[PDB]
Design an enzyme around this catalytic site. Structure first.
Site, PDB file in Angstrom:
ATOM      1  N   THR A 169       0.814  -1.228  -0.091  1.00  0.00           N
ATOM      2  CA  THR A 169      -0.239  -0.042   0.354  1.00  0.00           C
ATOM      3  C   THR A 169       0.293   1.341  -0.065  1.00  0.00           C
ATOM      4  OG1 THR A 169      -0.205   0.639   2.354  1.00  0.00           O
ATOM      5  CG2 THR A 169      -1.324  -1.271   1.648  1.00  0.00           C
TER       6      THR A 169
ATOM      7  N   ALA B  16      -6.644  -2.256   8.147  1.00  0.00           N
ATOM      8  CA  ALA B  16      -7.985  -1.729   7.684  1.00  0.00           C
ATOM      9  C   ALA B  16      -8.733  -1.338   8.788  1.00  0.00           C
ATOM     10  CB  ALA B  16      -8.526  -2.263   6.467  1.00  0.00           C
TER      11      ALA B  16
END
Lengths: 237, 239, 239, 248, 193, 231, 220, 210, 225
Positions: free
Chosen positions: H1, H49
């Site tokens: 990411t 997340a």
């Protein structure tokens, strides 16, 4: 002190609740008027001295974007109730990603009221609330929340020391076709009637809830404009 | 339930007075007079013993005056058992402060903490207040010599000279009459003994009826042995 | 002051005095005597209601293998004390590895009673407890506990409305015999003595249903069946 | 327990009524006395029997608190018994377990006074209805005699009496006590002082007397540690009391 | 790792602290100030575990500020370092220790003396003429042991600090992005280059 | 009266006056009727408004599709007890996958209410409940009183003037108990019953609410224009 | 002691323009053994919300039970107001994160209609992070199923044939019947190639008209 | 990411990728890594997340309560300290978080705080976080200016995410762009990294190796 | 613990313990506050002066609390307020506003009117200060009930009715005192209508006036009257 706070009277009523209701009769007037266009709240800002800064009194508060509250009685007790209500509304948005209904919030506040005793707060609250809001399910709603933990929805309501006269005028003059401007002037009319002071933008405060912009308290300038408009139109009534 | 028997300590009267505090103060008005005098070079503590008999060990009885640390002493008026409870708490607090900061506790910090303990019993818990007034004599490097009083309310105030217990209106009158800021510890010893002698409700002031202490310059902290009280009573011309 | 265990101005505990009154509610008299190596308890049994099961009506309790207890006072408080005493004795044996002595149990139960005299929230139990055993060290032992938390050992004792008549007759017997115990080798003759003496004191004959009898021996405490009491009563009729 | 509030409170005159009533209970109690000599302390009391059938030998009005500290009381016997148990435990847990040493008399007296004070202020309790005389020895302070009252106030005495006869006894002790008094003289004076306040029958069965005196190595129960002192507390036997009374 | 250095000279305490903050593979920041002012004349620098250092230093700062408000008085650098030591000594026994090493530089206005205290995460406190944590001392103490004089002026102290930093930059393999330098003296705390 | 100050005090005749006063709370409440056949159980409630501008307060609360109740008296106590009953039904469903019997629910309420009569510091509930449900034993109606007494009935009424409706139900029992095919005629029987408790007042789509539960009829509340059929 | 196991199973949510599909195989396995050929993993939770919590089946059952209870309680305290799929997703996040430190070891999918009436699919990790998605596969054969659906539903990597890679193949409306056909073929291929993919396929279809159930046999 | 935020005259740019991975498997191409805390605050999800999403939504709730109590917008400093204190209370419990709290207030101006699971709280002008952070820094440090245009700043953010997407297998899917202004944040849309890659490769002429 | 309902409603709906706490305030030593355009001035009319300091306590460097009533109760409120100010400064990144602190203290007082086993505080406070980057002066009052409100000038304690009538005559709500000298002169005049003065100014500029300055004002006032 002889009697425990939780006791029933022989008439089947809790003494401390009844006496809390007697405390609310001493409170300054709050008036709510619900309309299909919005709910108006107005309060008597009963300043105890001219050195008091009337703008600090804040007897109308935001509970959430579309929910407001007006208080009468022991207004220091209201801060706990409003803290709870605001927490409930924000927590509801957190847990459901949606606004709380006005009725569910009023219930959350009324669930607080009888949680008093020994073996919990020591006494009921000494404050009544007019809870006004909008939601998508039931629209513009006004509720009267009472230290009994009961609440009713109202088309219009007065609370505090002026309440019996103001409510008689609300019974006379409320109707389903009132516009928000008409509700504003009717609130100001009945405040002026039951207020002992001369109504002005310092003696009183207004607010409304509308779905387009939510809860807002009116500034003194707008309120003075409305009081001028009332003073004009009163020539024809 | 038990509500019937609860006297409701910690309530206001209609005048806004705390009756248990006022009644504890009345109790203290029957206790033996204690006097503090702040001299330029030190502090005198003097107290009258109310209990007396030929069979008492006055040489080991130490009921009025207590060390709280090397720099602070208290005189007690009122219930000695309650005082001993509070004195033990104060001693512990002073040692906790030394442990934390590696410095001796300021006198006002000790006095404030003990006064706050006394205040707590007036506001919560439904217990009776402590029936004791203290005079605190101490030195610290911030204000030097300091004399405080505290009472059951947990009020405390600083003084140049102060009396607690029975005859305090007379004692404070005589102290107002004779106190001076310039006066030395040896002057204040005389003023203390002369005030006790003029205020005692006994026939004559005598070394067995007295407790005496001084804090004077490091700072030294002396509780007088009874022979020293004889010496000081003859030196002052009272015996 | 009349309602809770606080002092009256006379320094009395009225609730304790009134708990003594409760001990006579049952109108039952009990008698205990020491032999050379036994202790005997006699209690009256009054079962006027023909619908009662008489085998369930008892004021004598087996506390442990070695300790008996007889109670004067209402059965609910008696059963409270009995259960507590049983638990204490078992716990003592567990903690300390030996059977609880009768005097130690009496001390413990008296201390519980004192707690009820001192803490306002618990009432006294309206019972007098007489513990009996043959102690491993002290021999035959009678210890009697009351609502004040008083306890003492006895040579012999009686409890109930007529306790003075039984006690004075016992005292006269010891004046007649110049001994601290009943001089008999076997418990059956101590039972027969105790029954005869209760008869002489109360002025009433007993059927086997009118009594209950407890015997402590070195090995065990046990209660006599009605037919063993019959055997003792006919022995008295024939001896 | 719903009694979280104090049952002892100030009256408008500043009296703690329950404490004065506890002192009235004490003052109605059986007379006890103490006398400190140069070389010991006597504590003595009448043993009033509740019945001629009671074994007064089974009831200890004089109690060892430590090998060198003894107590006697006047007032409520059960309260005294519970205070003795608490004093013994606190002498261990608050001192012996820390310092390897039994407490000095004054510090144990302080601990007892603390226990008594807490009953005057904590919730839901009455004061103890007893006054204690606590006699002891310790290496630095020597022999000590203290009175502890229901308030938890305590005072060191040269001699004192408590209970019903305490006024006459204290007056006699003021006549008789002096700084040169030896323990045998103190015992003689104690026996005289009790004689004037006993309900007639006066003998080693109706009297309980203990001394704090010399160490008693025969009571120690073991040998071979020269630094281990025998107990200084010793209860006199009834025969010792009778022997002294016959010579009185 | 972080560099914190301290030098107590005649008139003042100089604290020097490295500007780098490194997380994993990257230098996130080159300008970080590893100090908190505890009082107008007391400064603490800190080094150690990420997060722990600032949480600890801010807790200390809040407590010293609370003391100052309550008493209307400033604690000595001695009392502050004793308090900080006590908090660190507790934390060793706690369920999650503050892994934080501090230098406390203060000017005692009652003594009119500069004071420098080194406290490790264990709560090992030592008053020192100059001090360091971790590997910074391994490279700097021989320079300080050689050149330090108790009567040094602030300017001589700063020059000696410059020599210590140059030696670290030469021999220490990390790039610590230089130091911020603070001076604590009778006039209070100022930042210098 | 020295004996009415708390629940833990018996009077010299064995009364518990605080419990009686909490029953007076119910007697001041507006009438509710309950009645049942074998297949269906019905609640009928007269709501009261505070004034012409107020709403009418809710008298009927659904617990489950198999169970619900109507209140007379102190509505916050009914909310407490309804939440508790909901929790008990939920627990039975979660742990046993069984519908809680109405009788057992009633006993659970009895036990919850009794504690407030026995110990200091609480108070009795000020609310009477009529509980209807359908279970494996068919239709049920319970009356709860905050003394903790729960009784299983074919019909009853609680609240002010409720003795008129109760008399009518007593008179018509042998008819309405047979109404097994036709929930609307059982509702009409209940509405005729409650009419006997009305004084100087009429039933309207505003003040009348109805509930019904039964064999294939999940607990449903009719209010507003939904009751205009039965007026 | 290991408090977790793997029971296999695969699930697939697809949001349509006016429908949602949630599909799952019906085989319950432990290691190489079949526990059951028809143990359904996809549930109608009320309010036209369908749910499946794939993974450790005890935690999946527990989460579904708790969600159904949350729906019931929401009805009790909102007058049987319909729970929104978006509010259900937030509530499920709170259910999962309440176990953050001893997680429900399941990948959850819920499906339904949004308040516009469009198909909605939400997917949740074991800890409760969630995203509205057009489609999500979960469980053992997700990697066998989803690339083919990306290719056939979203025309991914398909270009307009004459344009030599300049122009994408345009997206168009799939009916629920076309989606069901693609789901069936995807699960059939996963049955061919993944040993855990079951003996039967159960499809729940959510539309304005409600929830409907289709079942198709898979091999074995 | 890969996530980044940088301050400039126009305020703050926030740029993020949308890839999520589970080992080699691409679980999703469309993850929203920016959390819209409120109309004035953004957070960036780069840790776990669930932790970021849950606690930054709760942070939004705390901001709303503060606003109701105090009648004013909460500071970005206050919000980041609320979050960092919460995260520090769970230190060692295993939270996984690495977020930029981005906002623009009148008192503070445009402000970024980096907040870490370890309890780090750093203010700064530029932060890049995630597996692609070094590539994003490489572009951004080469090209950043304070006086950069808003459109140039959005392009720079997009190009730094693209550089990470090219080189970091765990970054990609699409670029989401946000612009924080005093008036609130503005979403500048979603940009598929493949389309963007081939566009930049032709228009800019970069990635000549490919 | 002890939980007795001490604050309860009377049949007329009063809470007697809060009214009697107000009686304690009314017996308590005066406090006076006068807000100007750019400062707030607080004043009050064998003791050792060094260790009997001003009744005006700093809660933080920018905000100041005076009180009337029970001194010991006030120490408890002041300590709580100081702790909250430091806590807000720690957990958030700013000093408290004057209204935040006032609301906190009024909440503490209110809670002690509605909590079992506690007496209400026999205290009223004046809270004066400036918000950290603001120059509108603030002057709030709190009461035992936990009511709070803002004032242009206020007095609490013993003589406060008379002093408040004086301030109402002499304070102009549309022409407030324009300088520190005017605020101090009005405060001293109000206190003489029957000395210690604190001036609060922006940027943590809190100054107790010297007695020699106060006596300058006092003599000027006694010369002009």
């Amino acid at each position: 002190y002889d009697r425990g706070v939780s006791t029933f009277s022989p008439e089947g009523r809790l003494f401390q609740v009844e006496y809390s209701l007697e405390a609310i009769k001493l409170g300054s007037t709050a008036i709510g008027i619900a309309t299909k266009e919005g709910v108006v709240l107005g309060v008597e800002k009963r300043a105890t001295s001219p050195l008091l800064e009337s703008d600090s009194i804040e007897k109308i508060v935001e509970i959430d974007r579309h929910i407001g509250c007006a208080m009468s009685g022991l207004t220091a007790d209201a801060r706990s109730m409003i803290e709870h209500a605001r927490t409930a509304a924000v927590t509801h948005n957190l847990y459901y990603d949606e606004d709380i209904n006005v009725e569910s919030l009023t219930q959350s506040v009324c669930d607080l009221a009888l949680r008093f005793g020994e073996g919990l707060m020591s006494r009921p609250f000494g404050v009544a609330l007019l809870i006004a809001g909008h939601d998508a399910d039931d629209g513009y709603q006004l509720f009267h929340a009472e230290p009994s933990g009961t609440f009713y929805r109202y088309n219009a309501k007065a609370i505090g020391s002026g309440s019996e006269g103001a409510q008689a005028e609300l019974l006379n003059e409320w109707h389903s076709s009132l516009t928000l401007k008409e509700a504003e002037l009717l609130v100001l009319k009945i405040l002026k009637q039951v207020m002992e002071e001369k109504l002005d933008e310092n003696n009183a405060q207004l607010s409304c809830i509308t779905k387009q912009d939510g809860f807002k308290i009116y500034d003194n300038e707008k309120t003075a404009e409305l009081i001028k408009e009332l003073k004009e139109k009163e020539a024809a009534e | 339930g038990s509500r019937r028997y609860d006297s409701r300590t910690t309530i206001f009267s209609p005048e806004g007075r705390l009756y248990q505090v006022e009644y504890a103060l009345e109790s203290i008005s029957h206790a033996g007079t204690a006097i503090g005098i702040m001299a330029s070079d030190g502090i005198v503590l003097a107290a009258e013993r109310k209990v007396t008999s030929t069979l008492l060990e006055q040489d080991t009885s130490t009921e009025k005056l207590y060390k709280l640390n090397d720099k602070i002493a208290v005189a007690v008026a009122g219930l000695t058992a309650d005082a001993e409870i509070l004195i033990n708490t104060a001693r512990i607090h002073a040692q906790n402060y030394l442990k934390t900061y590696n410095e001796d506790i300021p006198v006002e910090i000790l006095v404030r903490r003990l006064s706050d303990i006394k205040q707590g019993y007036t506001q919560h818990g439904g217990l009776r207040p402590f029936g004791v007034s203290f005079i605190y004599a101490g030195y610290d490097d911030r204000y030097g010599y300091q004399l405080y009083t505290s009472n059951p309310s947990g009020n405390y105030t600083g003084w140049k000279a102060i009396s607690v217990g029975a005859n305090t209106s007379a004692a404070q009158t005589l102290l107002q009459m004779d106190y001076k800021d310039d006066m030395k510890v040896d002057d204040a010893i005389e003023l203390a003994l002369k005030t006790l002698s003029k205020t005692t409700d006994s026939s004559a002031l005598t070394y067995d009826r007295l407790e005496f202490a001084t804090i004077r310059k490091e700072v030294y902290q002396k509780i007088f042995k009874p022979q020293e009280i004889k010496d000081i009573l003859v030196k002052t011309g009272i015996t | 002051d009349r309602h809770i265990t606080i002092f009256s101005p006379e320094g009395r505990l009225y609730q304790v005095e009134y708990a003594f009154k409760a001990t006579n509610q049952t109108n039952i008299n009990s008698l205990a005597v020491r032999g050379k190596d036994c202790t005997v308890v006699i209690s009256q049994k009054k079962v006027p209601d023909k619908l009662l099961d008489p085998t369930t009506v008892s004021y004598i309790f087996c506390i442990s293998r070695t300790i008996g207890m007889v109670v004067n006072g209402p059965i609910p408080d008696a059963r409270n004390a009995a259960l507590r005493a049983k638990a204490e004795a078992a716990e003592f044996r567990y903690k300390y590895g030996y059977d609880m002595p009768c005097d130690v149990l009496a001390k413990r139960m008296a201390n519980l009673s004192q707690i009820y005299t001192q803490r306002a929230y618990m009432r006294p139990l309206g019972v007098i407890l007489t513990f009996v055993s043959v102690d491993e060290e002290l021999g035959p032992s009678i210890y009697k506990t009351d609502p004040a938390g008083y306890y003492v050992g006895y040579k012999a004792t009686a409890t109930g409305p007529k306790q003075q008549e039984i006690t004075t007759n016992l005292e006269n017997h010891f004046k007649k015999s110049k001994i601290d115990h009943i001089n008999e080798e076997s418990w059956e003759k101590v039972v027969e003595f105790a029954i005869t003496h209760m008869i002489d004191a109360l002025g009433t004959e007993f059927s086997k249903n009118d009594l209950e009898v407890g015997v402590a021996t070195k090995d065990k405490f046990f209660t006599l069946s009605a037919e063993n009491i019959e055997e003792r009563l006919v022995a008295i009729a024939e001896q | 327990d719903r009694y979280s509030f104090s049952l002892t409170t100030f009256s408008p005159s500043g009296k703690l009524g329950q404490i004065d009533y506890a002192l009235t209970a004490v003052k109605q109690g059986v007379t006890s006395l103490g006398i400190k000599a140069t070389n010991g302390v006597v504590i003595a009391t009448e043993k009033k029997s509740s019945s001629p059938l009671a074994m007064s030998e089974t009831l200890s009005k004089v109690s060892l608190l430590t090998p060198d500290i003894g107590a006697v009381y006047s007032g409520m016997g059960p309260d005294y018994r519970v205070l003795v148990d608490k004093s013994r435990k606190v002498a261990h847990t608050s001192y012996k377990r820390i310092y390897g040493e039994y407490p000095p008399t004054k510090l144990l007296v302080s601990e007892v006074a603390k226990i008594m004070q807490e009953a005057t202020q904590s919730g839901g309790v009455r004061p103890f209805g007893v006054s204690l005389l606590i006699a002891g020895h310790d290496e630095f302070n020597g022999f000590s005699l203290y009175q502890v009252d229901p308030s938890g106030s305590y005072f060191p005495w040269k001699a004192t009496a408590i209970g019903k006869g305490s006024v006459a006894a204290k007056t006699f002790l003021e006549k008789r006590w002096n700084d040169e008094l030896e323990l045998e003289d103190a015992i003689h004076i104690a026996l005289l002082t009790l004689k004037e306040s006993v309900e007639g029958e006066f003998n080693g069965d109706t009297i309980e007397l203990a001394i704090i005196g010399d160490e008693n190595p025969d009571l120690l129960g073991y040998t071979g540690i020269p630094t281990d002192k025998g107990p200084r507390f010793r209860k006199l036997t009834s025969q010792e009391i009778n022997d002294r009374l016959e010579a009185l | 790792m972080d560099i914190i250095l301290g030098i107590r000279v005649q008139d003042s305490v100089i604290l020097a602290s490295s500007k780098a903050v490194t997380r994993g593979i990257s230098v996130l920041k080159d300008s970080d100030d590893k100090t908190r002012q505890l009082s107008p004349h007391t400064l603490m620098s800190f080094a150690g575990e990420a997060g722990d250092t600032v949480q600890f230093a801010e807790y200390i700062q809040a407590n010293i500020q609370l003391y100052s408000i309550r008493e209307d008085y400033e604690l000595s650098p001695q009392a502050v370092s004793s308090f900080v030591r006590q908090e660190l000594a507790k934390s060793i026994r706690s369920r999650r220790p503050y892994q934080v090493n501090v230098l406390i530089g203060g000017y005692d206005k009652k003594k009119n003396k500069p004071e420098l205290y080194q406290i490790d995460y264990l709560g090992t406190k030592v008053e020192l003429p100059y001090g360091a944590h971790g590997y910074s001392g391994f490279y700097t103490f021989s320079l300080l042991d050689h050149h330090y004089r108790p009567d040094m002026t602030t300017e001589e102290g700063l020059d000696l600090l410059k020599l210590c930093v140059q030696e670290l930059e030469k021999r220490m393999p990390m790039d610590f992005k230089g130091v911020i330098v603070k001076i604590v003296d009778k006039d209070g705390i100022r930042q210098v280059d | 009266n020295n004996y009415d100050g708390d629940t833990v005090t018996f009077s010299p005749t064995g009364r518990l006056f605080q419990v009686e006063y909490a029953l007076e709370a119910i007697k001041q409440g507006s009438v509710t009727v309950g009645l049942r056949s074998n297949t269906h159980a019905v609640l009928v409630a007269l709501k009261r408004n505070a004034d012409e501008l107020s709403s009418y307060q809710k008298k009927i609360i659904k617990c489950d599709e198999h169970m619900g109740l109507s209140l007379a008296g102190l509505a916050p106590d009914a909310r407490v007890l309804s939440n508790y009953l909901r929790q008990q039904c939920n627990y039975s469903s979660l742990v046993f996958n069984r519908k809680l019997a109405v009788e057992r629910a009633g006993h659970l309420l009895c036990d919850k209410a009794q504690k407030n009569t026995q110990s200091y510091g609480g108070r009795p509930y000020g609310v009477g409940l009529l509980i209807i449900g359908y279970d494996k034993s068919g239709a049920h109606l319970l009356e709860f009183q905050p003394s903790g007494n729960v009784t299983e009935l074919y019909g009853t009424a609680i609240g002010a003037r409720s003795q008129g409706a109760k008399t009518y139900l007593e008179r018509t029992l042998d008819t309405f108990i047979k109404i097994d095919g036709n929930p609307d005629e059982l509702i009409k029987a209940g509405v005729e019953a409650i009419s006997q408790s009305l004084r100087d007042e009429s039933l309207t789509v505003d003040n009348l609410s109805i509930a019904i539960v039964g064999k294939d009829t999940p607990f449903t509340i009719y209010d507003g224009e939904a009751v205009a059929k039965y007026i | 002691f290991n408090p977790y196991g793997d029971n296999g199973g695969t699930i697939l949510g697809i949001a349509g323009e006016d429908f949602a599909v949630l599909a799952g195989d019906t085989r319950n396995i432990t290691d190489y053994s079949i526990n059951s050929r028809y143990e359904p993993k996809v549930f109608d939770c009320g309010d036209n919300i369908v749910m499946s919590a794939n993974g450790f089946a005890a935690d999946g059952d527990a989460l579904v039970k708790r969600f159904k209870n949350s729906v019931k309680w929401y009805h009790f305290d909102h007058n049987d107001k319909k729970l929104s799929i978006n509010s259900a997703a937030r509530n499920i996040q709170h259910l999962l994160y309440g176990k953050r430190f001893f997680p429900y070891y399941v990948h959850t999918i819920i499906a339904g209609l949004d308040e516009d009436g469009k198909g909605a699919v939400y997917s949740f990790d074991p800890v409760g992070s969630y995203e509205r998605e057009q489609c999500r596969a979960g469980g053992a054969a997700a990697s066998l199923i989803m690339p083919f659906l990306d290719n056939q539903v979203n025309f991914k990597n398909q270009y307009e044939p004459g344009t030599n890679g300049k122009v994408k193949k345009p997206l168009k409306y799939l009916s629920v019947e076309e989606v069901i056909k693609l789901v069936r073929d995807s699960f059939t291929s996963a049955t061919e190639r993944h040993i855990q993919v079951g003996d039967g396929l159960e499809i729940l279809i959510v539309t304005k008209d409600g929830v409907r159930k289709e079942f198709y046999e898979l091999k074995r | 990411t890969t996530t980044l935020a940088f301050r400039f005259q126009g305020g703050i740019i926030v740029a993020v990728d949308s890839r999520a991975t589970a080992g080699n498997w691409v679980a999703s191409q469309t993850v929203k890594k920016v959390i819209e805390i409120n109309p004035f605050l953004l957070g960036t999800m780069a840790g776990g997340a669930a932790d970021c999403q849950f606690w930054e939504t709760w942070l939004g709730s705390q901001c709303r309560l503060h606003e109701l109590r105090e009648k004013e917008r909460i500071s970005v400093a206050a919000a980041s300290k609320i979050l960092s204190n919460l995260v520090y209370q769970y230190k060692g419990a295993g939270l996984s978080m690495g977020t930029m709290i981005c906002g623009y207030t009148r008192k503070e101006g445009p402000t970024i705080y980096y907040v870490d699971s370890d309890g780090t709280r750093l203010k700064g002008d530029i932060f890049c976080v995630g597996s692609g952070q070094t590539f994003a820094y490489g572009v951004l440090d080469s090209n950043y200016k304070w006086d950069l245009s808003v459109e140039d700043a959005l392009y720079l953010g997009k190009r730094s995410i693209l550089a990470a997407a090219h080189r970091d297998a765990y970054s990609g899917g699409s670029v989401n762009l946000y612009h924080v202004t005093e008036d609130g944040w503005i979403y500048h849309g979603n940009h598929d990294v493949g389309e963007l890659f081939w566009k930049v490769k032709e228009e800019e002429g970069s990635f000549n190796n490919v | 613990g002890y939980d007795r309902a001490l604050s309860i409603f009377s049949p007329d709906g009063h809470i007697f313990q809060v009214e009697y706490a107000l009686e304690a305030v009314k017996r308590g030593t005066c406090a006076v506050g006068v807000k100007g355009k750019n400062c707030v001035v607080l004043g009050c009319e064998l003791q050792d002066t060094r260790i009997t300091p001003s009744k005006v306590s700093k809660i933080d460097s920018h905000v100041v609390l005076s009180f009337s009533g029970l001194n010991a109760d006030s120490r408890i409120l002041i300590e709580k307020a100081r702790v909250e100010a430091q806590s807000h400064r720690l957990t958030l990144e700013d000093p408290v506003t004057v209204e935040y602190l006032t609301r906190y203290v009024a909440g503490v007082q209110q809670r002690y009117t509605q909590s079992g086993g506690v007496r209400p505080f026999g205290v009223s406070t004046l809270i004066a200060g400036f918000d950290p980057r603001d120059d509108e002066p603030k002057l709030y009052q709190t009461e035992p009930s936990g009511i709070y409100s803002s004032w242009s000038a206020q007095t609490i304690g013993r003589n406060s009715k008379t002093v408040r009538e004086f301030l109402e005559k002499n304070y102009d709500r549309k022409e407030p005192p324009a300088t520190v000298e005017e605020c101090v002169k009005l405060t001293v005049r109000s206190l003489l209508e029957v000395i210690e003065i604190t001036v609060v100014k922006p940027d943590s500029d809190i100054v107790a006036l010297s007695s020699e300055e106060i006596n300058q004002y006092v003599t000027q006032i006694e010369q002009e009257k």
